[PDB]
Structure formats: structure tokens, C-alpha cells
PDB file of C-alpha atoms in Angstrom:
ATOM      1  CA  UNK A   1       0.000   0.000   0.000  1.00 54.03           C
ATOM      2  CA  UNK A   2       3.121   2.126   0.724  1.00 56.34           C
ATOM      3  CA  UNK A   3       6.297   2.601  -0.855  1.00 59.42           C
ATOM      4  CA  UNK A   4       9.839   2.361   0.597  1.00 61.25           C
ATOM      5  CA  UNK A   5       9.902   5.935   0.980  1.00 62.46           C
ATOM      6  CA  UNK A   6       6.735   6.356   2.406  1.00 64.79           C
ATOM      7  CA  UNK A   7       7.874   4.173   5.263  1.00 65.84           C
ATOM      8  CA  UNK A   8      10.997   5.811   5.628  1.00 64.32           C
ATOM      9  CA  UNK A   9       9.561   9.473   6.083  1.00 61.41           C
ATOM     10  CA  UNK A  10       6.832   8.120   8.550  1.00 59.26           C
ATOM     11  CA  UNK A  11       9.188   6.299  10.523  1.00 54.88           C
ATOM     12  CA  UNK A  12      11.999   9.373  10.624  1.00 57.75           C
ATOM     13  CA  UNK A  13       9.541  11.542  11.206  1.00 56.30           C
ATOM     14  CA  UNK A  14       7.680   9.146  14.020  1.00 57.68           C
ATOM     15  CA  UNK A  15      11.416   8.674  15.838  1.00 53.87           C
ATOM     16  CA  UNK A  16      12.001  12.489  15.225  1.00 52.70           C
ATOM     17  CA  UNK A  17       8.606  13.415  17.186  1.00 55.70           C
ATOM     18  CA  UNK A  18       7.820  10.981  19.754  1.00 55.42           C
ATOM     19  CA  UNK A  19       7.457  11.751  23.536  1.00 54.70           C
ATOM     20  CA  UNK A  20       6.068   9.812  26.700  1.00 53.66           C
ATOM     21  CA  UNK A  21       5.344  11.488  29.954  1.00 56.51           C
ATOM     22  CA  UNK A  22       7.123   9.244  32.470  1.00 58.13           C
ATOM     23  CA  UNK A  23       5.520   9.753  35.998  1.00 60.70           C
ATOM     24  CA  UNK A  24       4.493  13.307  34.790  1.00 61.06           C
ATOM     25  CA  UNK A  25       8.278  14.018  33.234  1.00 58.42           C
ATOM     26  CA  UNK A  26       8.366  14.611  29.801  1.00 61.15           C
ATOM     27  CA  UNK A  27      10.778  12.095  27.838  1.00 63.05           C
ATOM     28  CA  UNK A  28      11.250  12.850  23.866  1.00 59.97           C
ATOM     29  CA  UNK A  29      12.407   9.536  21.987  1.00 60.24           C
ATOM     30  CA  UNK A  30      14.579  10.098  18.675  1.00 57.17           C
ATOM     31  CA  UNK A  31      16.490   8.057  16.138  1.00 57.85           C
ATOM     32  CA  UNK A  32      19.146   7.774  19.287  1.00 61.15           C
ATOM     33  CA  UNK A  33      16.800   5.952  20.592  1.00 61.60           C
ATOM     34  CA  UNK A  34      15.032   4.147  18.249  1.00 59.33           C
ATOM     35  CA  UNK A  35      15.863   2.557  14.524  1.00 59.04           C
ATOM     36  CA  UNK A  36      13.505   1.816  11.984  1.00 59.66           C
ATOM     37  CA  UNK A  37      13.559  -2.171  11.399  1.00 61.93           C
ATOM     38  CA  UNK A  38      10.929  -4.741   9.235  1.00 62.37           C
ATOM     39  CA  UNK A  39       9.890  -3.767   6.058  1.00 60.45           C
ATOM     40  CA  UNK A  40      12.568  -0.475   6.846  1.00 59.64           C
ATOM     41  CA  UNK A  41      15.642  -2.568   7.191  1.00 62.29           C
ATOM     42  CA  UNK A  42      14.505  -4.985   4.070  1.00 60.66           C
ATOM     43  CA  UNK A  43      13.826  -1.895   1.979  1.00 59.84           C
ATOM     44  CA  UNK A  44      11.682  -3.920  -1.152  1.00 59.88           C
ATOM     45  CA  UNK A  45       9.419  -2.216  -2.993  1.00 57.56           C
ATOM     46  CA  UNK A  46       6.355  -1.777  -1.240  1.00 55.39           C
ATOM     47  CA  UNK A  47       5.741  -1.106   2.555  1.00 55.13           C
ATOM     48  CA  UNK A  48       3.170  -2.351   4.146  1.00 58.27           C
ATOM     49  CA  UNK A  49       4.072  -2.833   7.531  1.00 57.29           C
ATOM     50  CA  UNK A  50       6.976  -1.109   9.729  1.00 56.59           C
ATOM     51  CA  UNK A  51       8.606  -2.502  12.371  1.00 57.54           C
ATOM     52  CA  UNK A  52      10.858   0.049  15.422  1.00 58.18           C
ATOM     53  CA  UNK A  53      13.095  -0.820  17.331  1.00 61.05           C
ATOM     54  CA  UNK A  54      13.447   1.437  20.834  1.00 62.60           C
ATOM     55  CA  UNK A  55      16.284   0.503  23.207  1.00 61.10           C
ATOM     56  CA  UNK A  56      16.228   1.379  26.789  1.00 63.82           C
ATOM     57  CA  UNK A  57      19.106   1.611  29.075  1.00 64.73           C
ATOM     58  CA  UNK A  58      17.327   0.407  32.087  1.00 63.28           C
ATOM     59  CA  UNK A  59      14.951  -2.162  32.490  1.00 61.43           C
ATOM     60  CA  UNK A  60      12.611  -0.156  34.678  1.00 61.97           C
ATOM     61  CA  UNK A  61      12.594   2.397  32.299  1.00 63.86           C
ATOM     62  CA  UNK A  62      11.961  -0.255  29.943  1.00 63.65           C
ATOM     63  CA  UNK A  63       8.605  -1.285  31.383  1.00 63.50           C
ATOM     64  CA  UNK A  64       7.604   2.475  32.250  1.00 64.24           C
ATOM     65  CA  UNK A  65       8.427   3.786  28.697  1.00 66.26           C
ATOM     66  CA  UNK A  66       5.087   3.456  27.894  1.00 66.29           C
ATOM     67  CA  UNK A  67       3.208   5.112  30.018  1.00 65.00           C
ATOM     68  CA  UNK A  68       1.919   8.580  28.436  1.00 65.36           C
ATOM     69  CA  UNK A  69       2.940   7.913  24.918  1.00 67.96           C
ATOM     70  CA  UNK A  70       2.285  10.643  22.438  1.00 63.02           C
ATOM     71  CA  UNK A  71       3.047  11.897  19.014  1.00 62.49           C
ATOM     72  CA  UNK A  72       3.302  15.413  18.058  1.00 59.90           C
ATOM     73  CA  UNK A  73       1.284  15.953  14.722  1.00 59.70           C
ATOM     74  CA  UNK A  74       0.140  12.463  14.053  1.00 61.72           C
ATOM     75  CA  UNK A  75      -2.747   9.959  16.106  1.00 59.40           C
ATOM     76  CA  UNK A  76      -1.839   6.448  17.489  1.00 64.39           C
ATOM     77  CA  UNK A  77      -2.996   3.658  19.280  1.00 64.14           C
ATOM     78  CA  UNK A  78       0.356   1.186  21.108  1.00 62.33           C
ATOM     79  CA  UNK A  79      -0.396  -2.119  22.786  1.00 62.77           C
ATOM     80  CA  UNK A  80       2.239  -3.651  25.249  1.00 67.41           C
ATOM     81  CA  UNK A  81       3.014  -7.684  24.964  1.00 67.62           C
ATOM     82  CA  UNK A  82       5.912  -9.291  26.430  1.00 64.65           C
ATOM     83  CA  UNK A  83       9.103  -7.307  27.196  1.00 67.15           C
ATOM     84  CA  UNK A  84       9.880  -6.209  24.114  1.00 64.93           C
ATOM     85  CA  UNK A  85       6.811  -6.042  21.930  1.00 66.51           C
ATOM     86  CA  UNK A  86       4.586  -2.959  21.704  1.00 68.59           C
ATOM     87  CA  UNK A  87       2.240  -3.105  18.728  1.00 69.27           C
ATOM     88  CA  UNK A  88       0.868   0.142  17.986  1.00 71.92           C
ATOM     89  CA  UNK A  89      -1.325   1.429  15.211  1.00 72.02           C
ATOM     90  CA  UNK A  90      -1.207   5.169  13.687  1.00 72.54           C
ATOM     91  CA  UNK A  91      -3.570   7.346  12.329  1.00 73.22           C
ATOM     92  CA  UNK A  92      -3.449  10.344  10.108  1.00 73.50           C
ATOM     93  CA  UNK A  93      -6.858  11.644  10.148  1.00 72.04           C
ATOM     94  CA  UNK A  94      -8.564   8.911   9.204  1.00 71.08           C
ATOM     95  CA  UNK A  95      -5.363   6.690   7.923  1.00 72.77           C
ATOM     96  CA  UNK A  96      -4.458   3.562   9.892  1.00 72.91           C
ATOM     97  CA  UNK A  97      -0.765   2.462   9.392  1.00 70.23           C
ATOM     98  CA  UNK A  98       0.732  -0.540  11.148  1.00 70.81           C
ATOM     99  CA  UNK A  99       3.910  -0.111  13.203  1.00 69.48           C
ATOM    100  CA  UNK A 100       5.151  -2.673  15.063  1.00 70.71           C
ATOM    101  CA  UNK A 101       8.218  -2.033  17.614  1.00 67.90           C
ATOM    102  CA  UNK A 102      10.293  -3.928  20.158  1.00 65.98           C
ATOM    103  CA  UNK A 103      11.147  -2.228  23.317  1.00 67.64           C
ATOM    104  CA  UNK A 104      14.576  -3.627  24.447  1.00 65.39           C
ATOM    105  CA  UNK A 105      17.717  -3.092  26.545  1.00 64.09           C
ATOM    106  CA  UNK A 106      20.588  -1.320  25.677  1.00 64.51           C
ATOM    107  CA  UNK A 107      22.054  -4.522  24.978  1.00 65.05           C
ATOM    108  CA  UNK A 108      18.951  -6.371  23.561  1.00 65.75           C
ATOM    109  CA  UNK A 109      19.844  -3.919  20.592  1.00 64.39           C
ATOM    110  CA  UNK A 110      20.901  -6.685  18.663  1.00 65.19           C
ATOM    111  CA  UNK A 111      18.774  -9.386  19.250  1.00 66.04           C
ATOM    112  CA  UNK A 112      15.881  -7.173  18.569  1.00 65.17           C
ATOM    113  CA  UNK A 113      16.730  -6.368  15.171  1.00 65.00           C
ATOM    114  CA  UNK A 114      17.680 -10.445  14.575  1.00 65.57           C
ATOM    115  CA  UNK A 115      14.509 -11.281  16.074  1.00 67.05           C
ATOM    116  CA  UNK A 116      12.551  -8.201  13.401  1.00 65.76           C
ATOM    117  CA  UNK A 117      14.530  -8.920  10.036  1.00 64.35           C
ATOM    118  CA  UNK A 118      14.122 -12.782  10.852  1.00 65.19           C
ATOM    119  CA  UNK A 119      10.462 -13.860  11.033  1.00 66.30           C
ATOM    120  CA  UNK A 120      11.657 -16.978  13.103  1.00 66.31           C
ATOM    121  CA  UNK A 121      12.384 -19.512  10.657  1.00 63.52           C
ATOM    122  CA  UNK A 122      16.229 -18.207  10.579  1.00 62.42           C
ATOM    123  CA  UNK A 123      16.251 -18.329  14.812  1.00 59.87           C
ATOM    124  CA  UNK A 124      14.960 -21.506  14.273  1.00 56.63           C
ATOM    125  CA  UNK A 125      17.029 -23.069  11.973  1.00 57.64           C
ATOM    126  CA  UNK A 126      19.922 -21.213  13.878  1.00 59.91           C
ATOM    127  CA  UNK A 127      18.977 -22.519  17.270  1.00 59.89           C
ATOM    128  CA  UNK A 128      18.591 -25.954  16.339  1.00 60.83           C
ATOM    129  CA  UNK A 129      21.375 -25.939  14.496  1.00 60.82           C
ATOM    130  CA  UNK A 130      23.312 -24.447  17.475  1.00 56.46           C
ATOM    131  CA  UNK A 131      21.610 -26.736  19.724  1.00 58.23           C
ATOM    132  CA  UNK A 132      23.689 -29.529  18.267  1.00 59.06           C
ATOM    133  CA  UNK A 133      26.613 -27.493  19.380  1.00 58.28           C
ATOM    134  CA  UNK A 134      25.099 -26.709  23.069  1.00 58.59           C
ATOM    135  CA  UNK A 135      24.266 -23.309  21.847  1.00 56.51           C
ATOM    136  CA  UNK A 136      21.154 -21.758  22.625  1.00 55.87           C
ATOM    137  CA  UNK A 137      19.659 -18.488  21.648  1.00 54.74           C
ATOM    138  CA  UNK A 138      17.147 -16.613  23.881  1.00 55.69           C
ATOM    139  CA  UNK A 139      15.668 -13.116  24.464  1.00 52.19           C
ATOM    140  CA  UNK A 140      17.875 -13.422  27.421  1.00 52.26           C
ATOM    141  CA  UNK A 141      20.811 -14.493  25.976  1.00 50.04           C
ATOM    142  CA  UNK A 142      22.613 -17.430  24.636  1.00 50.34           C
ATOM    143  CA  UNK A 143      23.379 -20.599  27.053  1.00 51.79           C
ATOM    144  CA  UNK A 144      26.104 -22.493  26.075  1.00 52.31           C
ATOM    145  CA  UNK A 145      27.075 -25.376  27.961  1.00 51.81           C
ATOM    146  CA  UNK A 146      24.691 -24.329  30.784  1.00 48.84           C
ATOM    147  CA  UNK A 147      26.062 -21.077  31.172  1.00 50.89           C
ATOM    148  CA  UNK A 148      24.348 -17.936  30.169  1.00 53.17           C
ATOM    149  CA  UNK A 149      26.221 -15.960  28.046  1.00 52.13           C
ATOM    150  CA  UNK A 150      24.497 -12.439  26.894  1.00 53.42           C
ATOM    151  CA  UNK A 151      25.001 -10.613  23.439  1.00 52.60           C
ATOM    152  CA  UNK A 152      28.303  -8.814  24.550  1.00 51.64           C
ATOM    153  CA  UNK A 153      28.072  -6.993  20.596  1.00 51.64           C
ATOM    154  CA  UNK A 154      27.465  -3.468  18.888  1.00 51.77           C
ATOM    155  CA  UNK A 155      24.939  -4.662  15.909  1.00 50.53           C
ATOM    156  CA  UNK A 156      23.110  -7.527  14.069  1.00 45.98           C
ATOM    157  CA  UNK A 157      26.083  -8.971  12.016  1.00 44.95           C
ATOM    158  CA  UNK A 158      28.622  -8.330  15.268  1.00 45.99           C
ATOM    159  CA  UNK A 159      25.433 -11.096  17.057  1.00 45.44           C
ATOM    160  CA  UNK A 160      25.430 -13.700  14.520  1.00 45.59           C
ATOM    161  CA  UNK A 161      29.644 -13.462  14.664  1.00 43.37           C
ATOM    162  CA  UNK A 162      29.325 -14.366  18.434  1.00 45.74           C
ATOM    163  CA  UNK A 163      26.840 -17.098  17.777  1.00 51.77           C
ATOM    164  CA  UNK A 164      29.330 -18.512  15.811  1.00 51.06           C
ATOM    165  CA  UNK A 165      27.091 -18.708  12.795  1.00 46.56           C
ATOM    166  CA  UNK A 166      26.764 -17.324   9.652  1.00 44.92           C
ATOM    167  CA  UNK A 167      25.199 -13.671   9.196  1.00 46.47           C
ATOM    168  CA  UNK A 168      23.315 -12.605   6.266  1.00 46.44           C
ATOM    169  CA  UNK A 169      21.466  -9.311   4.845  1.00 48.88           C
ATOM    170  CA  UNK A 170      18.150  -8.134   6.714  1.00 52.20           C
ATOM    171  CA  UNK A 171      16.869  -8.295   3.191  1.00 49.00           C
ATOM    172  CA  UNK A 172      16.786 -11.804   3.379  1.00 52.21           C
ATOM    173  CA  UNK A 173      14.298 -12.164   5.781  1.00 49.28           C
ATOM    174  CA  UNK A 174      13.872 -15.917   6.463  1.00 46.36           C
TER     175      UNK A 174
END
């Protein structure tokens, strides 16, 4: 229904004005904060969905970074799941636009955007295949060999490198 660029303005423009009074404190989130992932990070032809990616450096902030969500110039509608999923629906007078976006640690910054470019069927082909190996992949971590080892990485190729797997394009989505 979209295009590529359609998605990308929407989504610069959505990390560029969003803010969230936090026990009546206003906190602004930008493109520091948050990175545009799904059909964003594929970049196709058409966009239809768009998935975010918002990192938090604590997790108590984590779970009270939604609390007075707002956007300046543009209507919305987020729903909390998990830890990091927040599914949230816009609307621009009378538009509806779906943007989906993961709400994770500072250091779940990887994992989120593995876990967003790759449906599943990667993490699962991954994690079985890793399991062979004692390696196991979870939204707390890998456990290898019983012990929990975290994603100690900067991005989504730097991840796969310490799974000791094979990294591919977010295009490829699998």
C-alpha cells in the first residue's frame, strides 16, 4: 500500500517526534533511541508494515516507557506484549498504518533487530542448528554449555559473529 519511501519518512519523522510522559516528566524519543527495522531494514518495494526498534538503558525504564505515549502531529494507538513487543497502530486523520516495535535493553539492541529482520524460521534453523553445538539463543541471551552468556556486541552482524554462525542481509528475511 506504501512505498519504501513512504515508510521511511513516517518512521523518521515518528522517531524524530515521539514523547512519553514518564511519571508526569516529559521524555522525547529520537532516532538515538530508536531505529527503523521490518519492512525499513529490508527496503523492497512496497511497505506495508513497519517494524521500530526502541532501546532502553534500564529495564525499569523499559517497562515504564510506555506510560503517556504521544506523538506530536500524528494519532496512534500502542499495545504492550511481552518485554519487548509494543504493537501500535497510527492514524493520520482517518489513515491507519501498522507499526510494530520492540522495546529492548541497551544490549537487547541486537537481538531485537535479529529477532525483526528474521520472522523466526532463521532463529529456528539457527537454534537448532546451534543446539547440536550446546548453543542456545534466547531473548535473554545465549546458554552455552549451561552457562548464560548475553550478546556482549554493537549490531546484528557483530550477534550472529558471536553465535558462531553465519550472518546474512536483513533483506533476506527468512
Amino acid at each position: 500500500m506504501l512505498t519504501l519511501i513512504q515508510g521511511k519518512k513516517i518512521v523518521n519523522h515518528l522517531r524524530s517526534r515521539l514523547a512519553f510522559e514518564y511519571n508526569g516528566q516529559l521524555i522525547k524519543i529520537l532516532s538515538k533511541n530508536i531505529v527503523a527495522v521490518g519492512s525499513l531494514r529490508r527496503e523492497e518495494k512496497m511497505l506495508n508494515d513497519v517494524d521500530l526498534l526502541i532501546i532502553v538503558p534500564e529495564k525499569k525504564l523499559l517497562k515504564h516507557v510506555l506510560p503517556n505515549i504521544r506523538i506530536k502531529g500524528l494519532s496512534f494507538s500502542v499495545k504492550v506484549c511481552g518485554e519487548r513487543k509494543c504493537v501500535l497502530f497510527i492514524e493520520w486523520e482517518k489513515k491507519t498504518y501498522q507499526l510494530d516495535l520492540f522495546t529492548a535493553l541497551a544490549e537487547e539492541k541486537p537481538y531485537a533487530i535479529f529477532h525483526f529482520t528474521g520472522p523466526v524460521s532463521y532463529l529456528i534453523r539457527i537454534r537448532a542448528a546451534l543446539k547440536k553445538k550446546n548453543y542456545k539463543l534466547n531473548q535473554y541471551g545465549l546458554f552455552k554449555n549451561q552457562t548464560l552468556v548475553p550478546l556482549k556486541i554493537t549490531t546484528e552482524k557483530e550477534l550472529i559473529k558471536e553465535l558462531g554462525f553465519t550472518y546474512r542481509i536483513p533483506k533476506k528475511r527468512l
